[PDB]
């Protein structure tokens, strides 16, 4: 659960890939969620 960036960047959605670093934590139970925003 460590942050890498503490400030906005740009509207470029292509940077969405940054999620790879934002997904440092792991949910305990997401059975309720059919899909995850990580891919959607």
Swiss-Prot record:
Site location (Susceptible to oxidation): 35
Coiled coil: none
Site features described as Implicated in free radical propagation, chain residue numbers: 33
Residues carrying sugar: 10
Site note Cleavage, residues: 1-2, 7-8, 16-17, 19-20
Known outcome of mutating residue 34 to V: In CAA-APP; Italian type
Effect of substituting residue 13 to R: Only 23% zinc-induced amyloid-beta protein 28 aggregation
Protein name: Amyloid-beta protein 40
Recorded consequence of changing residue 35 to V: No free radical production. No hippocampal neuron toxicity
Residues of the full protein shown: 672 to 711 of 770
Quaternary structure annotation from Swiss-Prot or TrEMBL: Interacts with S100A9.
Residues annotated for Cu(2+) 2 binding in this entry: 6, 10, 13-14
Impact reported for residue 35 to L: Reduced lipid peroxidation inhibition
Region ranges (Interaction with PSEN1): 24-40
Record: residues binding Zn(2+) 2: 6, 10, 13-14
Compartments where located: Cell surface
Record note on what altering residue 22 to Q does: In CAA-APP; Dutch type
Name of the encoding gene: APP
């Amino acid at each position: 659960d460590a942050e890498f960036r503490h400030d906005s960047g740009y509207e470029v959605h292509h940077q969405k890939l940054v999620f790879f670093a934002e997904d440092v934590g792991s949910n305990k139970g997401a059975i309720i969620g059919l899909m995850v925003g990580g891919v959607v």
